[PDB]
Amino acid sequence: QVQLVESGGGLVQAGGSLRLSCAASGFPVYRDRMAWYRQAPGKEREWVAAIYSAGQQTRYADSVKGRFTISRDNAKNTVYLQMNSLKPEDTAVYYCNVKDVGHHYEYYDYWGQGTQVTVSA
Amino acid sequence: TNLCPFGEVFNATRFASVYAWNRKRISNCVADYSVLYNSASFSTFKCYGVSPTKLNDLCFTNVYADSFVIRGDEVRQIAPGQTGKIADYNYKLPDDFTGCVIAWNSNNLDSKVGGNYNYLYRLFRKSNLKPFERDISTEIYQAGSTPCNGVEGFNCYFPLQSYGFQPTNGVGYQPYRVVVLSFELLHAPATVCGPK
Numbered sequence: 001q002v003q004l005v006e007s008g009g010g011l012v013q014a015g016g017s018l019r020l021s022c023a024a025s026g027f028p029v030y031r032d033r034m035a036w037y038r039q040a041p042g043k044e045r046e047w048v049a050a051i052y053s054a055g056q057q058t059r060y061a062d063s064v065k066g067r068f069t070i071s072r073d074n075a076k077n078t079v080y081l082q083m084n085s086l087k088p089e090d091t092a093v094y095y096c097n098v099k100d101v102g103h104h105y106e107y108y109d110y111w112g113q114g115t116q117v118t119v120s121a
Numbered sequence: 122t123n124l125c126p127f128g129e130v131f132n133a134t135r136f137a138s139v140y141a142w143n144r145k146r147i148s149n150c151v152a153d154y155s156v157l158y159n160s161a162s163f164s165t166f167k168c169y170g171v172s173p174t175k176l177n178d179l180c181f182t183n184v185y186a187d188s189f190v191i192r193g194d195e196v197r198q199i200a201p202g203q204t205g206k207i208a209d210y211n212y213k214l215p216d217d218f219t220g221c222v223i224a225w226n227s228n229n230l231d232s233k234v235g236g237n238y239n240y241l242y243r244l245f246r247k248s249n250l251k252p253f254e255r256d257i258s259t260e261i262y263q264a265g266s267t268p269c270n271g272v273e274g275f276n277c278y279f280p281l282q283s284y285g286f287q288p289t290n291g292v293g294y295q296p297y298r299v300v301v302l303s304f305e306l307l308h309a310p311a312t313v314c315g316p317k
Contacts (some may be wrong), residue, residue, distance in 0.1 A: 102285075
């Protein structure tokens with residue numbers, strides 16, 4: 001029932017910009033936490049950004065602070081990652097992520113399929 | 122001296138998340154507890170240190186009404202001596218509690234088609250809450266020894282979690298509104314008394 005679909009991405013030159021989208025079905029985008037992660041070739045998947053319903057609304061990994069902005073649209077049940085001043089190190093597959101709790105207090109990590117983002121030197 | 126405004130608490134349109142549970146002080150008014158207890162509107166109505174049928178005969182220095190939303194199978198944690206994520210990290214009753222825990226299923230008002238995720242509970246905390254302590258901070262929780270620096274990552278978690286209140290949920294995972302009445306009598310004149 002819970003499903004995340006990433007769209008956007010592709011190839012961009014260094015210094016360009018992109019907007020990734022995460023369409024959510026089965027749950028409202030207005031919730032505790034929605035996150036973006038990225039996995040570069042041969043590397044561990046790492047947290048990139050998150051938007052929160054309580055406290056500081058947005059948080060960002062150090063390497064993207066000041067260059068990425070996360071936001072949500074409730075009418076379209078979508079979360080966006082706007083990526084400016086892209087650099088080759090930003091090349092990765094990007095995923096959106098939520099953490100849900102179930103009836104027996106299980107904690108399940110939900111991921112999308114990922115979208116490829118390539119930034120050429 | 123005016124009726125106590127219990128309806129302001131029990132019929133509030135908006136209830137708090139348990140982590141930021143709400144407190145209202147009730148003072149200088151006539152309280153009718155029987156009309157609450159005998160209303161057939163509540164699935165839980167239990168008192169510690171007082172009997173529910175005798176509340177109308179009691180006078181108190183002050184009454185506190187704490188209110189919040191949890192899931193049904195967590196109602197059992199709103200009692201002295203209980204442990205669990207709610208009691209440990211969100212709302213803790215003392216061992217010597219005097220008061221009442223009142224709860225009712227609010228699925229008809231707190232469920233949305235598609236899910237209501239507005240209600241949050243604290244999932245991580247460094248230590249347990251003391252009785253009647255409120256923690257509303259929203260800092261990244263440092264689970265390990267490396268500081269988090271406002272950043273999620275390994276051993277670094279956002280501490281609040283949404284309840285996922287779908288209307289089709291099982292009754293244990295349905296939303297329940299909760300009011301905890303705390304009765305204090307000190308050596309001051311009683312301001313909250315029953316009728317007659």
